[PDB]
From a paper:
Single-domain antibodies (sdAbs), including camelid-derived nanobodies and human-derived variable heavy domains (VH), have emerged as a transformative class of biologics due to their small size, high stability, and superior tissue penetration. Derived from [name], Protein A is a 42 kDa surface protein consisting of five homologous immunoglobulin-binding domains (A–E) and an S region that functions as a signal sequence and cell wall-binding region (XM). It strongly interacts with the CH2-CH3 region within the Fc domain of IgG1, IgG2, and IgG4 and can also bind certain antibody fragments. Using this approach, we successfully reprogrammed multiple human-derived VHs and camelid-derived nanobodies to acquire high Protein A affinity, enabling efficient, tag-free purification via industry-standard Protein A affinity chromatography.
Additionally, we selected the camelid nanobody VHH3, which targets human TNFα, shares low sequence similarity with n501, and does not bind to Protein A, to further evaluate the versatility of our model. We also identified the L90Q mutation in both VHH3-M1 and VHH3-M3. The glutamine at position 90, similar to glycine at position 74 in n501, forms hydrophobic interactions with Protein A. However, its side chain can form hydrogen bonds with the side chains of N92 and R20, which are essential for binding to Protein A. This interaction can draw the side chain of R20 closer to D39 of Protein A domain D. In contrast, leucine at position 90 cannot form hydrogen bonds with N92 and R20, thereby removing the constraint on the side chain of R20. Consequently, the L90Q mutation may restore the interaction between R20 and Protein A. To validate this hypothesis, we resolved the complex structures of VHH3-M1 and VHH3-M3 with Protein A domain D through co-crystallization, achieving resolutions of 1.49 and 2.0 Å, respectively. The structural alignment of VHH3-M3 with VHH3-M1 is highly conserved (0.164 Å), differing only at position 88, which is located outside the binding region and exerts minimal influence on binding affinity. Most notably, residues R20 and N92 not only engage in hydrogen bonding with the side chain of Q90 but also form hydrogen bonds with Protein A in both VHH3-M1 and VHH3-M3, corroborating our initial hypothesis.
Numbering used by the authors:
A (entry chain H): 2805 to 2856
B (entry chain A): 2 to 127
Amino acid sequence: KDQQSAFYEILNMPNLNEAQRNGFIQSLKDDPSQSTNVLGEAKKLNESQAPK
Amino acid sequence: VQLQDSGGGLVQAGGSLRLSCAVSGRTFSAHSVYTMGWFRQAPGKEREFVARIYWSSANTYYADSVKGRFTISRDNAKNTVYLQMNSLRPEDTAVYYCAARDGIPTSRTVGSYNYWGQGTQVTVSS
């Protein structure tokens, strides 16, 4: 379920571009055991790329 | 065992890359007790551990500095290992090497791996 919820959130993060969203989604497919950490880094990039 | 790594290139900070490592030589069974990993050699630095995966179980282990950003995986049918690299930063600039051991590594150092790819070069620009 941590895979599943993370996929959805990453999909709808407003401040990632397509290449980033697609790469994080692939990482979730690649290694589901890292789902929480992958979501954490997607969140970090979503925050740092917030529009100014 | 023979290893050929590829996929490195130039990428802008924040971007993604996917490295591949084709395993060759003798034939692999899906449950061979092999371990594959990735090491990287930054400018002015020695080769440093990035990630490893046990071939049989697909159990993974990551260096702290790449957790959440990089994922290692392996496809037995294609006999290939992959490194997905996301949220890239200038300090990820390095030559990346596929590596393998016919067993369980006793350390995270180069000495624990006896088979090596030739390296693929990753450059992360600002």
